[PDB]
Design a protein around this ligand. Structure first.
Ligand SMILES: CCC1=C(C)/C(=C\C2=NC(=C\c3[nH]c(/C=C4\NC(=O)[C@H](C)[C@H]4CC)c(C)c3CCC(=O)O)/C(CCC(=O)O)=C2C)NC1=O
Ligand SMILES: CCC1=C(C)/C(=C\C2=NC(=C\c3[nH]c(/C=C4\NC(=O)[C@H](C)[C@H]4CC)c(C)c3CCC(=O)O)/C(CCC(=O)O)=C2C)NC1=O
Ligand SMILES: [Mg+2]
Ligand SMILES: [Mg+2]
Ligand SMILES: [Mg+2]
Ligand SMILES: [Mg+2]
Lengths: 307, 307
């Protein structure tokens, strides 16, 4: 049973209660239910809570359902709205679906099972469209970096292009590349930042975990994906440390050269926690692998000079 | 009215079937040709022989239960999803729920159907199958690209990398033949690796040494410009190329230049040998991306040469 936020927008307190009772009868999910009796507040709750689905009464005191959809501006998001219409007004349902709704229900004909089916579909379909959009953007990033590696030997340009595009794609506060010194200490080679996190470049913090251990887990590929340093169960030493650079969410991907650990591709969220998705993690492993190709390429260019 | 959609209705009631067809008339947006079957066996035959855009399936047929039917449906490999809409009697929603886990896209309740609801349900099933297809292909091409990147990162033998590109590309594309063309210093050319299917007679061991097009007619190939022929007889080609292509039984031709540094190293070639083929953007962009990776692969092998 996963969690779902469902927003009900209907001016009849009883219908809201009816729908609320119906959604609880769903074994597949646990629903957090938000309510509004007016369109304007519906819009406000929508904008503040990003609910997974919206049950929308076509006839509200302030807005008709069509006006509500038109007052919605949504990356490139899709609206998980189910229009609720009265029997006989199906023509509204059709023009609502052409305006962005995912499905509709007939008020007096609604059953719990039908409600589940509607919510499932609106959510699944928006998820498909969201995933497809993410696949397209993720492909642009990978191809753009592939392009760079084919067009140049220089690291400063490839790493830079990498750091920027991932920050753009992920909408992260910070992305940078951390490089290990021979004495297993670290420095930030490149960076790209949003002004919500206290900088790290030029202000170097000395950790003792990489000098002492050398990162054998990172050599053999270990990645860390911390959604929120306060709920992941880290030690008090680590939590307090990250709080001083305002890192709230942490994603770290090792960069490998030869059979050795060259450095780290690092993503930060500094304002709020962030649950890193499988697609995003997979993107970074891939880029890191391309960086390995770049580094290797640059070293073969160094070796070829000396000859 | 020109028919835009083919719908297969599988239901043992001739009256309900005609009823649904009339409902479909109320959709001004589309024109429906309806195939009808009263039995599972005939439904399956009609499905397999005529490839309808969507299916309305009665959960209870005289010979097969709706679930048993879905299990006998095999979908083409370029559209692996079943655009089936289950029709169940009320109270039997639970059977329909198990159908959507078995591949149906949606369901309807027998006595509750309205013309608009039928339209939207058919609309939805076709759009969702299309979304699911697009997402499915994005995942496959990313795997292909990610697999070649890995190989390059591992510094594996290039001919093995070339092999992998050639094989995996033909599978993803359902193409009759894919191969890699390599230029000799004297601007001729030979076929290094290949992947060929039923409809196509192979070309690899009988390579004709072509003229110096790379100097003037590969002006575009040096500058990275690709050729994408849907049908060699309508592309406006000269007799020499047309006759040449016909001697290899090429009907559709997609060729992508392979670059090493900024020089024309060779060509990635895709062929359809049976029928003409309109090459789609996803397919072309995949090929360009692979072409660039082979370019990066070629660079890795040359840099290891002096060293
Ligand atoms: C933001 C700027 C910055 C950081 C984060 C940095 C050090 C830093 N310490 C790290 C990990 C670490 N550092 C420590 C711990 C310590 N290190 C010590 O010097 C202590 C003795 C000790 C506890 C006080 C630990 C426990 C980790 C995490 C190790 C793990 O991954 O399990 C990491 C990698 C994981 C991460 O990014 O969270 C870095 C980059 N230096 C910097 O300039
Ligand atoms: C097994 C397959 C095979 C081929 C396809 C090959 C030759 C071959 N000739 C090509 C182009 C070409 N080849 C020719 C012309 C000629 N070529 C000649 O051998 C002529 C004597 C001459 C006719 C006058 C032309 C005009 C092109 C296309 C140039 C362009 O469109 O840029 C191409 C690349 C473009 C394409 O195929 O569309 C190849 C690979 N040798 C092979 O073993
Ligand atoms: Mg109302
Ligand atoms: Mg429905
Ligand atoms: Mg649906
Ligand atoms: Mg029947």
């Amino acid at each position: 049973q996963t969690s779902r936020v469902l927003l009900i927008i209907d001016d009849s307190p009883e219908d809201r209660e009816l729908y609320r009772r119906y959604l609880l009868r769903d074994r597949d999910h646990s629903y957090t239910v938000l309510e509004a009796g007016l369109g304007r507040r519906g819009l406000e709750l929508w904008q503040q809570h990003h609910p997974d689905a919206v049950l929308l009464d076509y006839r509200l005191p302030d807005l008709d359902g069509l006006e509500f959809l038109a007052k919605l501006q949504p990356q490139q998001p899709y609206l998980p709205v189910i229009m609720i219409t009265g029997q006989g007004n199906e023509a509204i349902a059709v023009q609502a679906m052409k305006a962005g709704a995912q499905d509709y229900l007939v008020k007096e004909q609604i059953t719990p099972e039908e409600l589940h089916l509607a919510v499932n579909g609106a959510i699944e379909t928006v998820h498909l469209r969201t995933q497809l959009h993410q696949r397209i953007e993720r492909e642009r990033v990978v191809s753009q970096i592939t392009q760079k590696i084919h067009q140049t030997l220089d690291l400063e340009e490839i790493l830079q292009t990498t750091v920027t595009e991932v920050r753009q794609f992920l909408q992260a506060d910070r992305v940078f590349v951390y490089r290990f010194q021979p004495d297993f200490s670290g420095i930030v080679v490149l960076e790209s930042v949003g002004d919500n996190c206290v900088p790290v470049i030029d202000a170097q913090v000395e950790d003792q975990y990489f000098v002492e251990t050398r990162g054998e887990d990172y050599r053999q590929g270990r990645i860390q994906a911390v959604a929120d340093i306060y709920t992941a169960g880290l030690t008090e030493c680590h939590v307090n440390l990250l709080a001083q650079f305002h890192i709230r969410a942490n994603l770290v991907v090792p960069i490998l050269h030869a059979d050795a650990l060259w450095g780290l591709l690092v993503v930060n969220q500094c304002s709020a926690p962030r649950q890193w998705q499988p697609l995003e993690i997979d993107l970074l492993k891939e880029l890191a692998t391309q960086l390995g190709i770049a580094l290797q390429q640059a070293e073969l260019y160094q070796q070829a000079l000396e000859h």
